[PDB]
A paper describes a structure:
Condensin protein complexes coordinate the formation of mitotic chromosomes and thereby ensure the successful segregation of replicated genomes.
To unambiguously determine the position and orientation of DNA bound to the Ycg1–Brn1 subcomplex, we solved the co-crystal structure of Sc Ycg1–Brn1 with 18-bp dsDNA to 2.98 Å resolution. As expected from the surface charge distribution and the results of the mutation experiments, we detected additional electron density corresponding to a DNA double helix within the Ycg1–Brn1 groove. In the crystal, DNA duplexes pack via base-stacking interactions, with one copy of Ycg1–Brn1 contacting two-thirds of one DNA molecule and one-third of a symmetry-related DNA molecule. The DNA helix is unwound by ∼65 degrees over 11 bp and bent by 7 degrees at one end, which results in an offset in the end-to-end stacking arrangement. This conformation is most likely necessary to compensate for the fact that the 18-bp DNA is slightly too long for the 1.5 helical turns required to produce the 21-screw axis observed in the crystal and is not a consequence of binding to Ycg1–Brn1. Several conserved basic residues of both protein subunits, including those we had mutated (Sc Ycg1K70, K71, Sc Ycg1K849, Sc Brn1K409, R411, and Sc Brn1K456 corresponding to Ct Ycg1K100, K101, Ct Ycg1K917, Ct Brn1R539, R541, and Ct Brn1K559), interact with the phosphate backbone of both DNA strands. Comparison of free and DNA-bound structures shows that Ycg1 and Brn1 undergo fairly minor conformational changes upon DNA binding. In addition to a slight shift of the N- and C-terminal shoulders of Ycg1, the most notable difference upon DNA binding is the reorientation toward the double helix of residues within the α1 latch segment of Brn1, including two positively charged residues of the BC1 patch (Sc Brn1K409 and Sc Brn1R411). The latter hypothesis is consistent with the formation of hydrophobic contacts between a valine residue located between the two charged residues (Sc Brn1V410) and the buckle residues (Sc Ycg1F808 and Sc Brn1W408) in the DNA-bound structure.
Residue numbers in the entry:
A (entry chain A): 8 to 74, 76 to 187, 204 to 347, 349 to 403, 411 to 497, 568 to 908
B (entry chain B): 384 to 412, 456 to 522
The structure:
Amino acid sequence: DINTKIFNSVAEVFQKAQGSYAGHRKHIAVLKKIQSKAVEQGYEDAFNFWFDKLVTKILPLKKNEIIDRIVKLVAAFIASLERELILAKKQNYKLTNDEEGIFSRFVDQFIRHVLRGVESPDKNVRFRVLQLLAVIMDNIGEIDESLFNLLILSLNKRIYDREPTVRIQAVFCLTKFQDFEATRTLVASIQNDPSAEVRRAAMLNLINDNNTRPYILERARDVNIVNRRLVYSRILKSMGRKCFDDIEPHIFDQLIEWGLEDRELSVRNACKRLIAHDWLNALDGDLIELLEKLDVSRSSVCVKAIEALFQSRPDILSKIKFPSIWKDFTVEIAFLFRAIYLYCLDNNITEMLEENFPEASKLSEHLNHYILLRYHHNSHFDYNTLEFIIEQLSIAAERYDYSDEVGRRSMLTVVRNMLALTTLSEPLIKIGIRVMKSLSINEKDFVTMAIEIINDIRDDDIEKQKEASSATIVLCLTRSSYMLELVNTPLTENILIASLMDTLITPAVRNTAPNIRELGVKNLGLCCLLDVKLAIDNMYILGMCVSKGNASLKYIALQVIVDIFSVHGNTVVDGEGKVDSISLHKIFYKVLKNNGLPECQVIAAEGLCKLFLADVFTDDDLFETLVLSYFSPINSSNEALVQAFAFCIPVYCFSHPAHQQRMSRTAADILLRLCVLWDDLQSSVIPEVDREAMLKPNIIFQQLLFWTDPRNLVNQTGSTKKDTVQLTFLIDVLKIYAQIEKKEIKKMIITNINAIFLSSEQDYSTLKELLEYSDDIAENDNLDNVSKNALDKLRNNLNSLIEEIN
Amino acid sequence: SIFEKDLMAYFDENLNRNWRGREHWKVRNKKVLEIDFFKTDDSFEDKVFASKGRTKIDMPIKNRKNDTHYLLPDDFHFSTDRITRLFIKPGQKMSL
DNA sequence: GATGTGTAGCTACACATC
DNA sequence: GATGTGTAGCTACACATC
C-alpha cells in the first residue's frame, strides 16, 4: 500500500518533469515532501529505492538528448536538500530530526546505484553516469572513506575511456576533489589526452595556483585553436593583473610573443584585446605603465603590441606630444617616441606629424647628449639603457624629413662622430649607417663618408703601432658590410670600394680566425652583387668554401652563391674561364644531403627553391631530388627543413603553369621512388627501427595531387580549366602503377585517385587516354572491392564527361 | 612586380594551414519523444548494469601518452616576403 | 557605463558511415 | 582511411537593461 503510493507520487514528478523545465522548482518542493512523509512512516528506503529505479530510465539516452531534464532535476533536488541542511545547522543549536542522517544516507545510496553502470558496455550509459555525478558532486557534503576511495578509483579508470565525451565528464567530476591526487590526474590529461576538448576541460577547470600555472599556460601552443585562444580570452583575463605579479617575466614575454604572431587571426585578436583593452583598463589607462610590464628589450613584440594598441585606441593617440621637456626620458618614452613617429608616417597622419614632434636639429641635440653620456664616460645596466635610447632615437632619425638643411647637417655630425667610436655596439653601427645613408641622398656621398670612417679606424691602429690588429679588422668588416648592404651601383662607379676590397676584405678571406673569415666572405659576397666579373672569379673559391669549410663558413658561403645566382642569373657559369654549372649542382647535393648539418640543409633547400622559382635552375633530375628530400625519412626530424619545403614547393607549383608542369612530369617518378623507400623501410628490421618517420604513400600521393591541381594557380585566365597538367600526372601514375608489387600500396594509390579534377573543357584525347588505362587496370589485375569501387567511380565520371560529345 | 604582390596576396593570406608540412595539411574546400516512468520493466531493463564482457570501453595503452604533448612545433614563419628577398642583402630582392 | 539577448553567419573540429 | 554532415565557440552589430 504505502510502498505503491510512494512510487506513484515520485513517478508522477518524473513523468511531467521530462517534458519541460517550467514547473521544476515545484517538483523539487514536492519531492522533499514525498521524502519527509515517507521517512516518518518508516519507509525511507522505499523512497530511495524508487528514486533510484526511475533515474535508471534515463541512463540509456544519447548525449544532448532533451530528456536530460531529469539530470537537471536530480541535481536541483540534491542541491536543495544540502542547502536546507547547511541552513538548518546555522539556525538550530542541535539538529533534532535526523536531518543530516537522511541526506548522508540518501546521497551515499544514490551514488553507489549509478556507479553500477560506470563500466557498462553501452557508450551512452557510461556518459550519463558520469554526467549525473558531475552535476551533483559539489553538493554531496561529507562522505565516508569507502565511498571516497570508490569515486577516485572509478574516475581514475574512466579518464582513459574510449569515448572522449565521457572523459570530459570524467574531468568535471575530478575538478571537485582538488583542494591532492586529483590535480596530478588533471595535469596528466591536459598534456597527454588526444581529445582537444578534454585538454580544454582540464585546462579551464584546473586550480590555477603557483604549481599548476605552468601546465595551464603551456596550452598557448596547443594544436587546437580554441585552446590556444582561451588562454588569452579567459585565463589571462580572469587573472587580471595577477599576470604581472605571479607569472615569471620570461614565460610572460613568450606568451604575448606567440599570441601576436600566431598563425590564426582568432588567436591574434584574442591577445590584442587582452593588451589594448583588458590590461590597459586594468592599469587605469597609464600607457607608460603598460610598457613597463611588456619588457621593451624585447622590442619586436612591443611594436606589434603598440601598433595593435593604436588601432584599437585612436583617441589616446592624438593626445601624446613631446614638448622640450625631454628631462623625463626613459626607455619606455624613448620606445614610444619611435613607435608613435613611425606609426604616423606609415598612415599619413598629417596633423600629428606637424607639431607633435621636435625639429630635426633639435633631435640631434638630444641624440648627441645620450652618446656623450654613454661613450665619452670617464654602472653597467645604465650602459645598456643608454645604448637602447640611442637606438630608438636613431631609428626615428633614419626616417626624419630633414627639410631643414641645418637639421640635416646637424644630425650628420652626430652620426659621423658616433660611427667613429671604436667602442660602438653592433646594433648602433647598423642603425648609425642607415641614418647616414638617409642624410646624403647621393650614394657616392654616402660611400665616400663611410670609407673615411672605416679607414680612419684602420689607420689609427696601424699608425699607433703593419696590417692592423685583428680586433680592429672586425670593427671595419662589420661597418663595411652594413655599408655595402645599402650600395646598389657597380664597383666601377665607386673607386674606393675596390681599394677597400684590396686592403682588408680580400685579406680577411685569407685570415685564419674563423669569425674574421666569415665576415670577409660576407663582404666579398656583397661586392660580387655589384660587379659581375668579380662574382665569376670567386665562384670556384666560394664553392670550395662550401665544400671544405666548417659548419659556420659552409653556412655563409652558400648564401652568397644563391644570392650571386639570384642577381646575375646563369652568366657566372658554363662559359670561358668560368665554373661549370654541374660543379655547383653537386655542391648543393652534398649540403641538401648532409644529414649531419641540419642548419646547412635549410639554406640549401630554401635556396634551391629560390633559384627554381627565378628560372635560373631548371634541371628536372635536381628538382626531383629536391622533393624527395622533403619526404625522405632522414630529414623528417629537421623541423626548419620541413616547414621550409612545406611553404616553398606550393609557391613554385602555383606560381606559374610552366612550373606546375615540371612537377607533373616528375611527380609520378617521385611517388614510385618514395613507395620503394617506405616499403623497404617496413620490412627492414634494425634496432633503431622507426617505420613511422615517413609519410604513408597514400598521404604522399594525396599531397602530389594538391600540388598538380590547376585550380590552385595564383593566376586564373579562365582558360586554365582546360589544363591537362593533372591528367598527365595521373596517367603517369597509372603507368608506373604496374611496377608496384605490394597490395596495400597499390591500394593507397587507387583509393585516392578520385580527388582529381574533371572538366568538360579538358582535352578529349587526354581524357580518353586516361580512361583506357583505367579500364586496363580494372578488367585485368583485379583489386580489392573498396579499390574497385573507387576506380569504377573514376571511370563512370570519365564516361560521363567524355560523353558530352556535341 | 605584380608577380611578388600577386604571389604575396594569394599565399600568405590563409595558406598557413599547411605551414607544418607532414600529414598536417587540410586544404579542404523527433526521436525518443517521451518516456513512461510508470510502465514496468520487470528486472530485464535494469540489465543496463551488464558487465563490459569483451567490449573494450578503454583507450589502447598506446594513446594514453604522447611525447609531443599535442603542442605546435616552433614557428619559423616562412613567408613570401622571405623568399623574394636576398639572403645577405634583405633590402634588395632578386628579379621579381 | 557595463552587462544582457537577438539575430545571424563563420571555420576549424569532431562525428558518422562503411 | 575516404567519404559527407554536424556542431562547439565564437564574431558582429543591434538594442534594452540596470
